[PDB]
Scaffold this active site. Sequence first.
Site, PDB file in Angstrom:
ATOM      1  N   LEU A  21       0.810  -1.217   0.000  1.00  0.00           N
ATOM      2  CA  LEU A  21       0.000   0.000   0.000  1.00  0.00           C
ATOM      3  C   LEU A  21       0.847   1.273   0.000  1.00  0.00           C
ATOM      4  O   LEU A  21       0.453   2.281  -0.605  1.00  0.00           O
ATOM      5  CB  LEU A  21      -0.962   0.004   1.195  1.00  0.00           C
ATOM      6  CG  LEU A  21      -1.853  -1.251   1.262  1.00  0.00           C
ATOM      7  CD1 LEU A  21      -2.814  -1.184   2.422  1.00  0.00           C
ATOM      8  CD2 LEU A  21      -2.606  -1.521  -0.076  1.00  0.00           C
ATOM      9  N   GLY A  22       1.996   1.222   0.683  1.00  0.00           N
ATOM     10  CA  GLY A  22       2.947   2.347   0.757  1.00  0.00           C
ATOM     11  C   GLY A  22       4.378   1.884   1.028  1.00  0.00           C
ATOM     12  O   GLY A  22       4.603   0.780   1.548  1.00  0.00           O
ATOM     13  N   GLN A  25      10.916   5.914   3.539  1.00  0.00           N
ATOM     14  CA  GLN A  25      12.222   5.882   4.145  1.00  0.00           C
ATOM     15  C   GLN A  25      12.318   4.845   5.271  1.00  0.00           C
ATOM     16  O   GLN A  25      13.374   4.240   5.449  1.00  0.00           O
ATOM     17  CB  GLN A  25      12.506   7.288   4.703  1.00  0.00           C
ATOM     18  CG  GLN A  25      13.939   7.585   5.005  1.00  0.00           C
ATOM     19  CD  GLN A  25      14.107   9.005   5.497  1.00  0.00           C
ATOM     20  OE1 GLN A  25      13.289   9.894   5.221  1.00  0.00           O
ATOM     21  NE2 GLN A  25      15.153   9.221   6.255  1.00  0.00           N
ATOM     22  N   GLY A  27      10.063   2.100   6.017  1.00  0.00           N
ATOM     23  CA  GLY A  27       9.565   0.767   5.745  1.00  0.00           C
ATOM     24  C   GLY A  27       8.381   0.840   4.808  1.00  0.00           C
ATOM     25  O   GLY A  27       8.175   1.872   4.113  1.00  0.00           O
ATOM     26  N   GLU A  28       7.569  -0.224   4.875  1.00  0.00           N
ATOM     27  CA  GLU A  28       6.430  -0.427   3.998  1.00  0.00           C
ATOM     28  C   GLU A  28       5.150  -0.717   4.794  1.00  0.00           C
ATOM     29  O   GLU A  28       5.191  -1.052   5.995  1.00  0.00           O
ATOM     30  CB  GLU A  28       6.708  -1.585   3.018  1.00  0.00           C
ATOM     31  CG  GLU A  28       8.012  -1.407   2.179  1.00  0.00           C
ATOM     32  CD  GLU A  28       8.332  -2.614   1.287  1.00  0.00           C
ATOM     33  OE1 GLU A  28       7.971  -3.750   1.672  1.00  0.00           O
ATOM     34  OE2 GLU A  28       8.953  -2.442   0.213  1.00  0.00           O
ATOM     35  N   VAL A  29       4.026  -0.529   4.113  1.00  0.00           N
ATOM     36  CA  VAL A  29       2.724  -0.889   4.641  1.00  0.00           C
ATOM     37  C   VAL A  29       2.044  -1.780   3.627  1.00  0.00           C
ATOM     38  O   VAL A  29       2.020  -1.460   2.448  1.00  0.00           O
ATOM     39  CB  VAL A  29       1.844   0.337   4.916  1.00  0.00           C
ATOM     40  CG1 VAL A  29       0.423  -0.142   5.346  1.00  0.00           C
ATOM     41  CG2 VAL A  29       2.532   1.226   6.000  1.00  0.00           C
ATOM     42  N   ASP A 134      -0.482  14.919  15.478  1.00  0.00           N
ATOM     43  CA  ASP A 134      -0.349  14.747  14.011  1.00  0.00           C
ATOM     44  C   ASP A 134      -1.760  14.612  13.414  1.00  0.00           C
ATOM     45  O   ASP A 134      -1.991  13.818  12.490  1.00  0.00           O
ATOM     46  CB  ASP A 134       0.456  13.502  13.725  1.00  0.00           C
ATOM     47  CG  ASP A 134       1.142  13.520  12.345  1.00  0.00           C
ATOM     48  OD1 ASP A 134       0.944  14.449  11.531  1.00  0.00           O
ATOM     49  OD2 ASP A 134       1.923  12.571  12.106  1.00  0.00           O
TER      50      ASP A 134
END
Length: 271
Positions: A21-22, A25, A27-29, A134
Amino acid sequence: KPWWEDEWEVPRETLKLVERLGAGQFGEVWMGYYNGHTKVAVKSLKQGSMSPDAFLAEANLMKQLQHQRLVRLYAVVTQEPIYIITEYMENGSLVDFLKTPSGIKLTINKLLDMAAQIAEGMAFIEERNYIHRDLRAANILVSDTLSCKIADFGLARLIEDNEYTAREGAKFPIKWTAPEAINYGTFTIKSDVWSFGILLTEIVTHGRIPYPGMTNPEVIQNLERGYRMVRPDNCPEELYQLMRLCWKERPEDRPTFDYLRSVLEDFFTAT
Ligand SMILES: COc1cc(Nc2nn3c(NCC(C)(C)N)cc(C)nc3c2C(N)=O)cc(OC)c1
């Protein structure tokens, strides 16, 4: 609790990562499945990109903050590559969803409903003595039933004494962050209240950038003169005045999230 006693620890083998999905810098999802059948989001830490302690700190905080209106921690794998596994939200981030064909068709009534759901989530955070820091439409996720949940607890902190003070070097998005936080690094639930006001503009503009046509230095200078964001196109004046309460000069004059929830539910049923 150590990993062998931690109820959130799962063997890595229980997980199948299916669609990315993403990637960034750090990691990943991934959308994936737990034990064959249960759809989950999996966030993986890129070794060396950042501290694994700092990475896992977000999961430990979610252990403490469990609510229907908050994205729920599902499991962790605490050996490298480290995974934080969470509740999957089928419609992705609010900011993206409001631009899709489904998102585009939503009435003002539904947008007000979603706003209330978010304030409801934030009222839980407030009650528990936490702050998020955030808060913004990019960090609200949307379910397949068009419900909303608070997400991304990386900057979220427990307060003991009203206030969390960031570092001198620390930088935050100017358009979303309360003046006292940008100026002094001092964050409170009332800073999150300010951000919620900005988030409201994103809801009503279907995900547009706040302060249309303005740079960060222009935003800072306008606010110091006592101006606030110009009325977004097609914003009900009621909602605009609710944004303005969020943007009061003194943090203590800004409303509670429980008040915001209450008001937005009234706006929603009146519509
Ligand atoms: C393409 O982005 C999508 C992301 C999701 N779900 C999710 N995306 N997402 C993240 N990525 C946000 C990005 C960078 C992708 N905007 C980060 C975290 C921590 N959880 C999630 C979920 C989560 N908890 O489910 C669902 C989609 O379905 C439309 C599409």
